Design an enzyme around this catalytic site. Structure first.
Site, PDB file in Angstrom:
ATOM      1  N   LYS A 104       4.572 -12.516 -11.356  1.00 15.54           N
ATOM      2  CA  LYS A 104       5.292 -13.699 -11.514  1.00 15.54           C
ATOM      3  C   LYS A 104       6.569 -13.089 -11.805  1.00 15.54           C
ATOM      4  O   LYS A 104       6.794 -12.322 -12.638  1.00 15.54           O
ATOM      5  CB  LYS A 104       4.176 -14.145 -13.406  1.00 15.54           C
ATOM      6  CG  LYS A 104       4.974 -15.078 -14.137  1.00 15.54           C
ATOM      7  CD  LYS A 104       4.598 -14.867 -15.251  1.00 15.54           C
ATOM      8  CE  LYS A 104       4.233 -15.944 -16.578  1.00 15.54           C
ATOM      9  NZ  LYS A 104       3.754 -15.476 -17.517  1.00 15.54           N
ATOM     10  N   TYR A 146       8.889 -22.057 -15.807  1.00 15.16           N
ATOM     11  CA  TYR A 146       9.755 -20.645 -15.567  1.00 15.16           C
ATOM     12  C   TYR A 146       9.587 -19.481 -14.640  1.00 15.16           C
ATOM     13  O   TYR A 146       9.793 -18.631 -15.272  1.00 15.16           O
ATOM     14  CB  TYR A 146       9.474 -20.724 -17.086  1.00 15.16           C
ATOM     15  CG  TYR A 146       9.623 -22.069 -18.898  1.00 15.16           C
ATOM     16  CD1 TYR A 146      11.364 -21.813 -19.145  1.00 15.16           C
ATOM     17  CD2 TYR A 146       8.632 -21.937 -18.732  1.00 15.16           C
ATOM     18  CE1 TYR A 146      11.560 -23.198 -19.038  1.00 15.16           C
ATOM     19  CE2 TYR A 146       8.643 -23.698 -19.710  1.00 15.16           C
ATOM     20  CZ  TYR A 146      10.553 -23.969 -20.338  1.00 15.16           C
ATOM     21  OH  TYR A 146      10.120 -24.894 -20.375  1.00 15.16           O
ATOM     22  N   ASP A 174      -2.084 -22.070 -26.156  1.00 16.66           N
ATOM     23  CA  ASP A 174      -1.958 -22.254 -24.308  1.00 16.66           C
ATOM     24  C   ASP A 174      -3.363 -22.140 -23.655  1.00 16.66           C
ATOM     25  O   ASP A 174      -3.231 -22.302 -22.657  1.00 16.66           O
ATOM     26  CB  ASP A 174      -0.927 -22.597 -23.614  1.00 16.66           C
ATOM     27  CG  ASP A 174      -0.667 -22.547 -22.372  1.00 16.66           C
ATOM     28  OD1 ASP A 174      -0.880 -24.637 -22.198  1.00 16.66           O
ATOM     29  OD2 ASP A 174       0.404 -22.784 -21.485  1.00 16.66           O
ATOM     30  N   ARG A 232       4.034 -21.986  -8.194  1.00 15.41           N
ATOM     31  CA  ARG A 232       5.177 -22.483  -9.091  1.00 15.41           C
ATOM     32  C   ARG A 232       4.598 -23.101  -9.758  1.00 15.41           C
ATOM     33  O   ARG A 232       4.127 -22.105 -10.819  1.00 15.41           O
ATOM     34  CB  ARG A 232       6.856 -23.236  -7.977  1.00 15.41           C
ATOM     35  CG  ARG A 232       6.096 -24.623  -8.123  1.00 15.41           C
ATOM     36  CD  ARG A 232       6.655 -23.720  -5.915  1.00 15.41           C
ATOM     37  NE  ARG A 232       6.526 -25.533  -5.490  1.00 15.41           N
ATOM     38  CZ  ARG A 232       5.362 -26.065  -5.077  1.00 15.41           C
ATOM     39  NH1 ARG A 232       4.130 -25.613  -5.294  1.00 15.41           N
ATOM     40  NH2 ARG A 232       5.280 -27.128  -4.811  1.00 15.41           N
ATOM     41  N   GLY A 233       6.310 -23.397 -10.521  1.00 13.28           N
ATOM     42  CA  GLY A 233       5.766 -23.402 -12.458  1.00 13.28           C
ATOM     43  C   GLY A 233       7.878 -24.236 -13.101  1.00 13.28           C
ATOM     44  O   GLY A 233       9.060 -24.012 -12.440  1.00 13.28           O
ATOM     45  N   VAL A 242       5.200 -17.478  -9.029  1.00  5.71           N
ATOM     46  CA  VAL A 242       4.043 -16.061  -8.715  1.00  5.71           C
ATOM     47  C   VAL A 242       2.924 -15.745  -7.649  1.00  5.71           C
ATOM     48  O   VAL A 242       3.324 -17.180  -6.609  1.00  5.71           O
ATOM     49  CB  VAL A 242       2.542 -16.805 -10.069  1.00  5.71           C
ATOM     50  CG1 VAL A 242       3.040 -17.460 -10.920  1.00  5.71           C
ATOM     51  CG2 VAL A 242       1.372 -15.851  -9.184  1.00  5.71           C
TER      52      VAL A 242
END
Ligand SMILES: N#Cc1cnn2c(NC3CC3)cc(-c3nnn(CCN4CCCCC4)c3-c3ccc(=O)[nH]c3)nc12
Length: 331
Positions: free
Chosen positions: A67, A49, A155, A46-47, A52
């Site tokens: 995603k 935003y 990033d 997850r995350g 996945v």
């Protein structure tokens, strides 16, 4: 007075010379595929935003990565899609296979090529001196291409590097923070994860460029050759700059601040102190010496500079003696 402006040393006007549609992502119209072509197999993570998944494209039996986005400004989804489409087919750039939406939920999902990744917390400790140069060279091909296409990744870190070690296949992923470079533009400094943030982000210098990615790449190289993860281990954004200053020294930092007429956040005054520039040897020891060589240190030193204008470009980095064997073997 205010800060002195800066321009990228290379690929300065590549976006200016392009038709507006190439970089004006706010007016990009998303081309949608059919969500019923994909079936979710399992969750990968997850995350903040996104969530996945691994999925199967049922029309051709191809394994893919999906995603599914959480609420994100439509211009930011347009930015990621536009950048992925502009970079498609480029060396070691992840391929965006499809863009789908749940018709009921209205939730968008980006569909990517699958890479049989080996997590860096297991893969990196097994890598040889030659593996490190080979993979660093592959990242550089991805960075030189995206920079020549007028894009900064912003990033670059191990989590955004997918490596299928069995097939010596690397892909630079997650273009969700990537931006188009425009001379004179002031960018958000709240980008990248703490340990990979360049000095320009930490001192709040907004007129940055592609060279930001070269700093993050240097942080990655240092963690790999010294087996010291993370290399600059800050407790927060302020302390992150202190950790860099304890290695690079405070003199080059204050010369950097003076050169660009940067107003330092007053919190820094009492924490930065005074530190000499250390020699790379103090990080060398019996268990990492097999990954460290004078050409690795020469290359590293030329990436980790406070002054963004004085770091190697991805193209200059590829011409470094550190890659002569990789270059010869690829010929
Ligand atoms: N694009 C792409 C892509 C190609 N392959 N492949 C694989 N392969 C391994 C399954 C073998 C995995 C992922 C992935 N796994 N977790 N996360 C999410 C971030 N993760 C969450 C858990 C903790 C660490 C951070 C991602 C991902 C996908 C897309 C993206 O933009 N950011 C990140 N992405 C990709």
């Amino acid at each position: 007075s205010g800060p002195v402006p800066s321009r990228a040393r290379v690929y300065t006007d590549v976006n200016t010379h392009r038709p507006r549609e190439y970089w004006d992502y706010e007016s990009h119209v998303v081309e949608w595929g059919n969500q019923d072509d994909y079936q979710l197999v399992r969750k990968l993570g997850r995350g903040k935003y996104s969530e996945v998944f691994e999925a199967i494209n049922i029309t051709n039996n191809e394994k893919v990565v999906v995603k599914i986005l959480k609420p994100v400004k439509k211009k930011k989804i347009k930015r990621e899609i536009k950048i992925l489409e502009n970079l498609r087919g480029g060396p070691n750039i992840i391929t965006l296979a499809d863009i789908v939406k749940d018709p009921v939920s209205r939730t968008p999902a980006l569909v990517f090529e699958h890479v049989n990744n080996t997590d860096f917390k297991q893969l990196y400790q097994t890598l040889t001196d030659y593996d490190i140069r080979f993979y660093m060279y592959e990242i550089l091909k991805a960075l030189d291409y995206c920079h020549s296409m007028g894009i900064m990744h912003r990033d670059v870190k191990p989590h955004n590097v997918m490596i299928d070690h069995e097939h010596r296949k690397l892909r630079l992923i997650d273009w969700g923070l990537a931006e188009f470079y425009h001379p004179g533009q002031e960018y958000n400094v709240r980008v990248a994860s703490r340990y990979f943030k360049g000095p320009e982000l930490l001192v709040d210098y907004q007129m940055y460029d592609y060279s930001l990615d070269m700093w993050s790449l240097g942080c990655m190289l240092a963690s790999m050759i010294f087996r010291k993860e993370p290399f600059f281990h800050g407790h927060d954004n302020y302390d992150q700059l202190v950790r860099i200053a304890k290695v690079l020294g405070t003199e080059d930092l204050y010369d950097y601040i003076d050169k660009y007429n940067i107003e330092l956040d007053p919190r820094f005054n009492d924490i930065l102190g005074r530190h000499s520039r250390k020699r790379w040897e103090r990080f060398v020891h019996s268990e990492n010496q097999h990954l460290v060589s004078p050409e690795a240190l020469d290359f590293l030193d030329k990436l980790l500079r406070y002054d963004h204008q004085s770091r190697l470009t991805a193209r200059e980095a590829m011409e470094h003696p550190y890659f002569y064997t990789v270059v010869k073997d690829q010929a």
